[PDB]
Write a protein that holds these residues in place. Structure first.
Motif, PDB file in Angstrom:
ATOM      1  N   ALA A 236      -5.627  -4.364  -3.721  1.00 26.79           N
ATOM      2  CA  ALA A 236      -4.302  -4.661  -4.301  1.00 26.79           C
ATOM      3  C   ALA A 236      -3.327  -5.741  -4.212  1.00 26.79           C
ATOM      4  CB  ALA A 236      -3.817  -3.451  -4.167  1.00 26.79           C
TER       5      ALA A 236
ATOM      6  N   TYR B 200      -4.255  -8.658  -3.464  1.00 27.09           N
ATOM      7  CA  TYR B 200      -5.320  -9.593  -3.807  1.00 27.09           C
ATOM      8  C   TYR B 200      -5.460  -9.468  -5.216  1.00 27.09           C
ATOM      9  CZ  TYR B 200      -5.211 -11.378   1.095  1.00 27.09           C
ATOM     10  OH  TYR B 200      -5.083 -11.992   2.211  1.00 27.09           O
ATOM     11  N   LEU B 201      -5.751  -8.531  -6.112  1.00 30.36           N
ATOM     12  CA  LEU B 201      -6.371  -8.531  -7.768  1.00 30.36           C
ATOM     13  C   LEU B 201      -4.596  -8.135  -8.330  1.00 30.36           C
ATOM     14  CD1 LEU B 201      -9.709  -6.747  -7.133  1.00 30.36           C
ATOM     15  CD2 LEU B 201      -8.981  -9.241  -7.216  1.00 30.36           C
ATOM     16  N   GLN B 202      -4.692  -8.489  -9.798  1.00 30.46           N
ATOM     17  CA  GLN B 202      -3.415  -7.947 -10.785  1.00 30.46           C
ATOM     18  C   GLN B 202      -4.102  -6.534 -11.415  1.00 30.46           C
ATOM     19  OE1 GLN B 202      -3.066 -11.539 -12.340  1.00 30.46           O
ATOM     20  NE2 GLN B 202      -3.336 -13.182 -11.123  1.00 30.46           N
ATOM     21  N   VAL B 203      -4.701  -5.797 -10.731  1.00 31.23           N
ATOM     22  CA  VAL B 203      -5.232  -4.506 -10.684  1.00 31.23           C
ATOM     23  C   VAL B 203      -4.573  -3.507 -10.193  1.00 31.23           C
ATOM     24  CG1 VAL B 203      -7.459  -4.893 -10.178  1.00 31.23           C
ATOM     25  CG2 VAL B 203      -6.292  -3.569 -12.610  1.00 31.23           C
TER      26      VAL B 203
END
Lengths: 48, 49
Positions: A17, A19-22
């Protein structure tokens, strides 16, 4: 236990979370993923 | 409240616990703020937006 081993639960380094936009629930299991599923789903449908 | 809740959720998800998401939402909110500041419009105590 496996989340502790690989550090993918919220709090340790390998958490997607940060590092990823989701969301964590909307992340593929091969990446840092939330493997939280019911046992009935895990028994009828499958593992993935 | 549909937006107070959204902003609080996005801020708690960007600060504190760190997520690369919840910055798009903050970007939208700041974009709305920048839209509001294009034209000056006074508001009294009961109408603070």
């Amino acid at each position: 236990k496996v989340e502790r081993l690989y550090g993918t639960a919220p709090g340790m380094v390998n958490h997607p979370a940060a590092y990823l936009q989701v969301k964590h629930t909307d992340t593929p299991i091969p990446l840092g993923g939330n493997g939280a599923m019911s046992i009935m789903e895990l028994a009828t449908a499958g593992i993935g | 409240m549909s937006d107070k809740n959204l902003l609080k959720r996005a801020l708690l998800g960007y600060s504190h616990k760190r997520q690369k998401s919840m910055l798009y939402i903050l970007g939208l909110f700041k974009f709305l703020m920048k839209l509001s500041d294009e034209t000056f419009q006074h508001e009294r105590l009961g109408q603070f937006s």
